C-alpha cells in the first residue's frame, strides 16, 4: 500500500536516490578517506565497469558497494552463525532491484529512528567495524609460524561491508524479521558500538587473536 508520492518519485536535485545528500558527510579515519567515494549521484549503479582495473573499486560509490555486498545468498562453503545458509533459488542473486529496495527501506528506518543522515551512520559503522590487525603464515628457515600483520584500507572496507551484510542475513534467517529491518539494526548497533553487532564482535575477535599470537 505504498503511496503514490513514493511509488512515482521524481527527483529535483542531484542526491543519492533523490532523497539524501552527502555534502555534510564527514570521515574522521585518515586511512579510509581516499577509498570511501561520496560523489553526488542519483543511481548508485555501475554496470560491471571498474572491476578489471586493479584499483578501480575506489571510483565506485559506497552505497553501490553496500548494495553489491547485500546481493548475496549467505554462507555457502563456510559456517556463519553456526549454520550453513544455502537458498539457491530463493536467493537475490543477479537481482539488483530487490537489493536497491532493501537498502532504501533500511535507510528510511534509520532516518526515522535516529533522525540523522543514514549515509553518515553507515560511514560511522564502517569506521567502527574496520579491523587494523590480522594474522598470516610466514616461514623462515623451513618451519611455519603465525605472525601479526597490518591491514590495508581497501581490505578493511571489504571486511566491514561483508560483516554488516552477513549479520543482516543471520538475523533474517528463518524469522519473522525482515532483511531490511535486520540491516538497519546491524548498522545502528555497529555505529553505536554495541556487543550485539556481528561486525564489531568479529573486529574485536580478530584484533584479540592477532595481539595474542603476535
Amino acid at each position: 500500500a505504498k503511496p503514490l508520492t513514493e511509488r512515482f518519485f521524481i527527483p529535483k536535485e542531484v542526491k543519492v536516490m533523490g532523497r539524501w545528500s552527502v555534502e555534510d558527510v564527514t570521515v574522521e579515519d585518515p586511512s579510509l578517506k581516499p577509498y570511501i567515494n561520496l560523489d553526488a549521484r542519483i543511481l548508485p549503479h555501475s554496470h560491471g565497469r571498474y572491476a578489471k582495473k586493479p584499483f578501480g573499486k575506489a571510483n565506485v560509490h559506497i552505497v553501490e558497494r553496500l548494495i553489491n555486498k547485500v546481493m548475496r545468498s549467505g554462507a555457502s562453503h563456510y559456517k556463519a552463525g553456526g549454520h550453513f545458509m544455502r537458498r539457491e533459488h530463493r536467493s537475490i542473486m543477479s537481482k539488483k532491484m530487490k537489493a536497491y529496495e532493501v537498502v532504501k527501506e533500511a535507510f528510511m528506518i534509520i532516518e526515522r529512528r535516529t533522525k540523522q543522515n543514514p549515509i553518515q551512520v553507515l560511514v560511522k559503522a564502517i569506521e567502527n567495524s574496520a579491523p587494523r590487525e590480522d594474522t598470516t603464515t610466514i616461514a623462515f628457515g623451513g618451519i611455519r609460524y603465525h605472525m601479526s600483520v597490518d591491514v590495508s584500507p581497501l581490505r578493511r572496507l571489504d571486511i566491514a561491508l561483508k560483516n554488516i551484510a552477513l549479520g543482516a542475513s543471520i538475523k533474517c534467517y528463518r524469522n519473522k524479521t525482515t532483511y531490511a529491518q535486520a540491516l538497519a539494526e546491524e548498522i545502528i548497533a555497529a555505529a553505536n558500538k554495541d556487543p550485539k553487532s556481528f561486525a564489531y564482535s568479529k573486529k574485536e575477535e580478530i584484533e584479540r587473536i592477532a595481539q595474542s599470537s603476535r
Binding site: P30, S31, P34, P54, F55, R132, E133, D134, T136, I138, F140, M147, S148, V149, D150, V151, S152, P153, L154, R155, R156, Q211, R214
Partner: peptide, 24 residues
C-alpha cells in the same frame, strides 16, 4: 619496516597499534 596484508601502493596510510616491531 613492516609487513602488510592486502593490496597497497605508494601513498596509502596504515594504522599501527605498535611502533616497536620492525619486521625482519
Amino acid at each position: 619496516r613492516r609487513n602488510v596484508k592486502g593490496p597497497v601502493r605508494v601513498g596509502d596510510i596504515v594504522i599501527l597499534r605498535e611502533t616497536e616491531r620492525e619486521a625482519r
